Coordinates of C-alpha atoms in Angstrom, one line a residue:
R1 CA 10.8 160.5 84.0
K2 CA 8.1 159.0 84.8
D3 CA 7.4 161.0 87.9
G4 CA 7.1 164.5 85.7
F5 CA 10.8 165.2 86.5
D6 CA 12.6 166.3 83.2
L7 CA 15.7 167.1 84.9
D8 CA 19.2 165.3 83.2
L9 CA 20.0 163.5 85.9
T10 CA 21.5 159.7 86.1
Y11 CA 21.8 157.2 88.8
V12 CA 25.1 156.0 88.2
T13 CA 24.3 153.8 91.1
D14 CA 21.1 154.2 93.7
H15 CA 22.9 156.1 95.7
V16 CA 25.4 157.6 93.5
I17 CA 23.9 160.8 91.2
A18 CA 25.3 162.7 87.9
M19 CA 23.6 165.7 86.7
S20 CA 23.5 169.0 84.7
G21 CA 14.3 175.5 91.7
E22 CA 13.2 171.8 89.8
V23 CA 16.4 170.5 91.2
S24 CA 15.7 171.6 94.9
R25 CA 11.9 169.9 94.1
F26 CA 13.9 166.8 93.2
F27 CA 15.6 166.1 96.5
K28 CA 13.3 167.3 98.6
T29 CA 10.9 164.7 97.7
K30 CA 13.2 161.6 96.5
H31 CA 15.8 162.4 99.0
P32 CA 14.8 164.4 102.0
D33 CA 17.5 165.6 104.3
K34 CA 19.9 162.8 102.9
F35 CA 21.5 164.0 99.7
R36 CA 25.0 165.9 98.9
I37 CA 25.4 167.8 96.5
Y38 CA 29.3 168.1 94.6
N39 CA 29.3 171.6 92.4
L40 CA 32.0 171.3 90.0
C41 CA 31.2 174.3 88.0
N42 CA 23.7 174.0 102.7
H43 CA 24.1 170.6 101.6
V44 CA 26.6 172.0 99.3
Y45 CA 30.5 170.8 98.6
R46 CA 32.2 173.2 96.2
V47 CA 35.2 172.3 93.8
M48 CA 35.8 174.5 90.9
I49 CA 37.4 172.6 88.2
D50 CA 38.0 174.5 84.5
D51 CA 35.8 173.2 81.5
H52 CA 37.9 169.4 79.9
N53 CA 40.5 169.9 82.8
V54 CA 41.1 167.5 86.0
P55 CA 40.7 168.0 90.2
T56 CA 44.1 168.3 91.6
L57 CA 45.1 165.2 93.8
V58 CA 44.6 167.2 96.6
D59 CA 40.8 168.3 95.7
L60 CA 40.1 164.7 94.6
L61 CA 41.5 162.9 98.2
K62 CA 39.5 166.1 99.6
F63 CA 36.3 165.2 98.0
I64 CA 36.7 161.1 98.4
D65 CA 37.1 162.0 102.5
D66 CA 33.8 164.5 102.5
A67 CA 32.2 161.7 100.5
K68 CA 33.0 158.5 102.4
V69 CA 31.9 160.3 105.9
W70 CA 28.0 161.3 104.5
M71 CA 27.6 158.0 102.5
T72 CA 28.7 155.6 105.7
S73 CA 26.9 157.3 108.0
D74 CA 24.0 156.7 106.7
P75 CA 22.5 153.7 104.1
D76 CA 19.8 155.8 102.5
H77 CA 22.5 158.9 101.9
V78 CA 22.7 159.7 98.5
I79 CA 25.6 161.9 96.5
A80 CA 24.9 164.2 93.5
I81 CA 27.9 165.4 91.6
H82 CA 27.1 168.7 89.3
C83 CA 28.4 170.3 86.6
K84 CA 27.9 172.0 82.8
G85 CA 27.1 169.0 81.6
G86 CA 28.2 166.8 84.3
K87 CA 30.4 165.0 81.4
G88 CA 34.4 164.7 82.2
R89 CA 34.9 166.9 85.7
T90 CA 31.7 164.6 87.0
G91 CA 33.1 161.8 85.6
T92 CA 36.6 162.1 87.0
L93 CA 35.0 162.1 90.8
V94 CA 31.8 159.6 90.5
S95 CA 34.3 156.8 88.7
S96 CA 37.1 157.8 91.8
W97 CA 34.5 157.2 94.2
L98 CA 33.1 154.2 92.8
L99 CA 37.0 153.1 93.3
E100 CA 37.0 153.8 96.6
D101 CA 33.8 152.1 97.2
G102 CA 34.5 149.3 95.9
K103 CA 32.3 148.5 93.1
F104 CA 35.3 148.3 90.6
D105 CA 39.2 147.4 90.6
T106 CA 40.8 149.4 88.2
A107 CA 40.2 152.9 86.7
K108 CA 39.3 151.3 82.7
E109 CA 36.2 149.9 84.8
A110 CA 34.8 152.5 86.7
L111 CA 35.3 155.3 83.7
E112 CA 33.8 152.8 81.1
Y113 CA 31.1 152.1 83.7
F114 CA 30.3 156.1 84.0
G115 CA 30.4 156.3 80.7
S116 CA 27.9 153.4 79.8
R117 CA 25.6 155.0 82.4
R118 CA 25.9 158.7 81.7
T119 CA 25.7 158.6 77.8
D120 CA 24.7 157.0 75.0
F121 CA 27.9 156.1 73.7
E122 CA 28.2 152.5 75.8
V123 CA 32.1 151.4 76.7
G124 CA 33.6 151.5 72.9
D125 CA 33.8 155.3 72.5
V126 CA 33.2 156.0 76.4
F127 CA 36.9 157.0 76.8
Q128 CA 37.4 160.0 73.8
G129 CA 33.5 160.7 73.8
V130 CA 33.6 161.3 77.4
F131 CA 37.1 162.3 79.0
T132 CA 40.5 164.1 77.9
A133 CA 43.4 162.5 78.1
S134 CA 44.4 163.9 81.6
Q135 CA 40.9 163.1 83.2
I136 CA 41.5 159.2 82.8
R137 CA 45.0 159.5 83.7
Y138 CA 44.0 161.4 87.1
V139 CA 41.4 158.5 88.0
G140 CA 44.1 156.2 87.0
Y141 CA 46.1 158.5 89.8
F142 CA 43.5 157.8 92.6
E143 CA 44.0 154.1 91.7
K144 CA 47.5 154.3 92.4
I145 CA 47.2 156.3 95.7
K146 CA 44.4 153.8 97.0
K147 CA 46.5 150.6 95.7
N148 CA 49.9 151.7 96.7
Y149 CA 49.8 154.6 99.1
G150 CA 47.3 153.6 101.5
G151 CA 44.4 156.4 99.7
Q152 CA 47.4 159.1 100.8
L153 CA 49.2 161.4 98.5
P154 CA 52.2 159.7 97.3
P155 CA 55.8 161.4 98.9
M156 CA 56.4 164.9 97.2
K157 CA 58.8 164.9 94.7
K158 CA 60.3 168.1 93.2
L159 CA 61.4 168.9 89.6
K160 CA 62.7 170.8 87.0
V161 CA 61.6 170.3 83.1
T162 CA 65.0 170.8 81.7
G163 CA 63.6 168.8 78.0
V164 CA 60.8 168.8 75.6
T165 CA 60.8 166.2 72.8
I166 CA 58.3 165.8 70.2
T167 CA 57.8 163.2 67.7
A168 CA 55.7 163.3 64.4
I169 CA 56.5 166.3 64.0
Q170 CA 55.6 166.8 59.8
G171 CA 52.3 168.3 59.2
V172 CA 51.8 169.9 62.7
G173 CA 51.9 173.5 62.5
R174 CA 54.6 174.5 60.5
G175 CA 56.2 171.3 60.4
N176 CA 59.7 171.8 62.3
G177 CA 58.5 173.4 65.9
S178 CA 59.3 177.0 64.6
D179 CA 55.5 177.8 65.2
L180 CA 55.7 176.5 68.9
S181 CA 55.4 177.4 72.4
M182 CA 55.5 176.1 75.5
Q183 CA 53.8 177.5 78.8
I184 CA 54.4 175.4 82.4
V185 CA 51.4 175.9 84.7
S186 CA 51.3 175.7 88.7
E187 CA 48.2 176.2 90.9
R188 CA 46.7 178.4 88.4
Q189 CA 49.9 180.5 86.9
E190 CA 52.2 180.4 84.3
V191 CA 55.8 179.9 85.9
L192 CA 57.3 178.9 82.5
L193 CA 57.0 180.1 79.4
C194 CA 59.3 179.0 76.2
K195 CA 59.2 180.3 72.5
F196 CA 60.5 177.4 70.6
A197 CA 61.9 179.5 67.2
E198 CA 63.2 182.2 69.3
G199 CA 65.0 180.2 71.6
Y200 CA 63.3 182.1 74.5
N201 CA 63.8 180.5 77.7
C202 CA 64.6 177.5 75.2
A203 CA 67.3 175.9 72.3
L204 CA 65.4 174.6 69.4
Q205 CA 66.5 171.4 67.4
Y206 CA 65.0 170.2 64.5
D207 CA 65.9 166.6 63.1
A208 CA 64.3 165.8 59.7
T209 CA 65.3 162.1 59.7
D210 CA 63.8 161.1 63.2
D211 CA 61.2 163.5 62.1
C212 CA 61.0 165.8 65.3
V213 CA 61.8 168.3 67.6
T214 CA 64.0 168.4 70.7
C215 CA 63.8 171.7 72.9
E216 CA 66.6 172.3 75.5
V217 CA 64.3 174.1 78.9
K218 CA 65.9 176.6 80.4
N219 CA 65.3 178.4 83.2
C220 CA 62.9 176.0 84.8
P221 CA 61.6 177.1 88.7
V222 CA 61.4 173.9 90.7
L223 CA 57.7 172.4 90.1
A224 CA 56.0 170.7 92.9
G225 CA 52.8 168.8 92.8
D226 CA 50.1 169.1 89.5
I227 CA 51.4 170.2 86.6
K228 CA 49.9 171.6 83.5
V229 CA 51.6 172.0 80.3
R230 CA 49.9 173.9 77.3
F231 CA 50.9 174.2 73.7
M232 CA 50.5 176.7 71.4
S233 CA 51.3 177.8 67.8
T234 CA 51.0 180.6 65.4
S235 CA 50.2 178.8 62.4
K236 CA 46.8 178.5 60.3
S237 CA 46.5 174.6 59.9
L238 CA 47.0 173.8 64.0
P239 CA 43.6 173.7 65.3
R240 CA 42.9 174.4 68.6
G241 CA 41.0 172.3 71.0
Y242 CA 40.0 172.4 74.4
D243 CA 41.1 175.0 76.8
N244 CA 42.2 177.4 73.7
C245 CA 44.9 175.8 72.6
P246 CA 46.4 172.9 70.0
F247 CA 47.5 170.6 72.5
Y248 CA 48.3 169.9 76.5
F249 CA 48.1 167.9 79.4
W250 CA 48.3 167.6 83.3
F251 CA 50.6 165.5 85.3
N252 CA 51.5 164.9 89.2
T253 CA 55.2 165.3 90.0
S254 CA 55.5 162.4 92.9
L255 CA 53.9 160.0 90.6
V256 CA 56.4 160.4 87.9
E257 CA 58.7 157.8 87.1
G258 CA 62.9 158.3 86.4
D259 CA 64.1 161.3 84.7
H260 CA 61.1 161.4 82.1
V261 CA 57.4 161.0 80.9
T262 CA 56.3 159.8 77.8
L263 CA 53.2 160.6 76.7
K264 CA 51.5 158.8 73.8
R265 CA 48.7 160.8 71.5
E266 CA 46.4 159.0 73.2
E267 CA 47.5 160.6 76.5
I268 CA 47.5 164.3 75.3
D269 CA 44.6 166.3 75.3
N270 CA 42.8 167.0 72.1
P271 CA 45.3 164.5 70.0
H272 CA 42.8 162.4 72.1
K273 CA 40.2 162.6 70.1
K274 CA 39.7 161.1 66.5
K275 CA 39.0 164.2 64.3
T276 CA 42.8 165.4 65.1
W277 CA 44.6 161.9 63.9
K278 CA 45.3 163.4 60.5
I279 CA 47.1 165.7 62.3
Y280 CA 48.3 164.0 65.1
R281 CA 49.6 160.6 63.9
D282 CA 50.1 157.3 65.4
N283 CA 53.5 157.9 66.2
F284 CA 52.8 161.6 68.1
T285 CA 54.7 161.9 71.3
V286 CA 55.5 164.7 73.7
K287 CA 58.2 163.5 76.1
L288 CA 59.0 165.7 79.1
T289 CA 63.0 165.2 80.8
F290 CA 63.2 166.4 83.9
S291 CA 66.2 167.3 86.6
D292 CA 65.6 166.4 90.6
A293 CA 64.7 169.5 92.4

């Protein structure tokens, strides 16, 4: 800002920018004809990602391909990734790029580096100060793709949710799952809704001894690719976090191992924030049971 530019702009590296008339002016003078801008919310590449959500794995690989050709074609080329505040969504793509460009071997290091450069958190509180749990997971997904699938999408696995289990239920909503409903979202569309107490597409069992609820999930259509699962509540005590609900997460069907996915507190979106840890206890987990489809 010694040059007089007042932009919320960070050189994550010398050639990788994260940011939130003055902007066009900055790139025209500092990087004339040598910039590519990525809009997350004609040297412009658009990818629309909802606040506090992830790009699909397809969105992410498309971006990587586009970024790579631009970056490799000229030493002085720069990429600039912009968002609302240029935080979690921006960090997801930048960290993925940093992994692609070889600067880091692991997602954890890439993510932590982005957080240290972009924010004044620095290392320690980066993971939940900057990213959602799904955002962390998706950069981890990209790491696995690069290491084990040659930078390409894994073989498609199609699944159906046959069950959901939630542990440490006491103190969450009404404490017996009766306030809860579950929505499954694929490609921006609701594909299943379960209302627990009522038995609407499901059957609820509450176990007071194990402090858990288990719900048989009925009528799930075939799920393929990136799946968002949202939980809603009619209770007064369960706060809504991001995404207008108590808790939610994204996963990719083709990266599920075995017949289930179990997510710990820190792996679920909203409970990942420390402010909620009086509600979501250390043993709070959500597990989805699948069948092959």
